[PDB]
């Protein structure tokens, strides 16, 4: 038995850390990480016996080997396999697949953010590598003229809203003091890509 996580979606430029868990029989065998939709036609990318891009760490005591793939590119999308190198065992017992979809655009940590009127909330907008140099914007849905846009230093600030772009992976939008009219749909956006975020402002408490 070899098992791993379910299919993944990751923004271009980010890394993944994949556990390949295996049964206690397989502690002593070489572990490998394979790419291809068809196990019998796959290409080995890294092995646990390599002499001393992708990193492998087999931990027999925890009965898992961990595969790290860094700086993923869109062309890295596809099927991958955890494998144990052992002869004379059913291939299904010593391999496990998963699909990695490397995406270009934006995503959001939490697409529903709520807070009491008069308090502050933060939205964390994530973006893939191709948007590092784009101005970032926060817009109210339905209102083109409402966008608040970062400057050349990745910054926007007025009385109500601050945007801080870390210039590599994410920009945060801080709504500094919610009013109940702020409830509704918004966009994190860069270039022609966007991700929807809902803000729910709840009543002030006694």
Numbering used by the authors: 1 to 52, 61 to 214
Sentences from the paper on this structure:
Protection is conferred largely through the function of the polymeric Immunoglobulin receptor (pIgR), which transports and stabilizes secretory antibodies and also functions as an innate immune factor. The transport cycle of pIgR starts when pIgR at the basolateral membrane binds dIgA or pIgM, and the resulting complex is transcytosed to the apical surface where proteases cleave the pIgR ectodomain (now referred to as secretory component, SC), releasing it into the mucosa as a complex with dIgA or pIgM. SC specifically protects secretory Ig from proteolytic degradation and confers innate recognition functions upon SIgA and SIgM, allowing them to bind and exclude bacteria.
To compare SC structures across evolution and to facilitate the design of chimeric proteins for characterizing SC-ligand interactions, we solved the 1.7Å crystal structure of teleost fish SC (tSC) (Rcryst = 18.5%; Rfree = 21.5%). Teleost fish express the oldest recognizable pIgR protein, which transports polymeric versions of IgM and IgT/IgZ (a teleost Ig specialized in mucosal immunity) to the mucosa. In addition, tSC contains just two extracellular domains, tD1 and tD2. tD1 and tD2 share homology with mammalian D1 and D5, respectively, but CDR loop residues implicated in mammalian SC interactions with pIg are not conserved. The structure of tSC revealed two tandem Ig-like domains related by ~90°. Like hSC domains D1 and D3-D5, tSC domains are IgSF folds that include the canonical B to F strand disulfide bond and a second disulfide bond linking the C and C’ strands. tD1 and tD2 share a similar topology, but only 72 of 97 Cα atoms could be aligned (rmsd = 0.87Å). Aligning fish and human SC domains resulted in rmsds of 0.77Å for tD1 and D1 (83 of 100 Cα atoms) and 1.08Å for tD2 and D5 (64 of 97 Cα atoms). The interface between the two tSC domains is formed by residues in the tD1 A’-B and E-F loops and residues in tD2 CDR1 and DE loop, burying a total surface area of 591Å2. Ten of the 17 residues in the interface are well conserved among representative fish species, and five inter-domain hydrogen bonds may limit inter-domain flexibility.
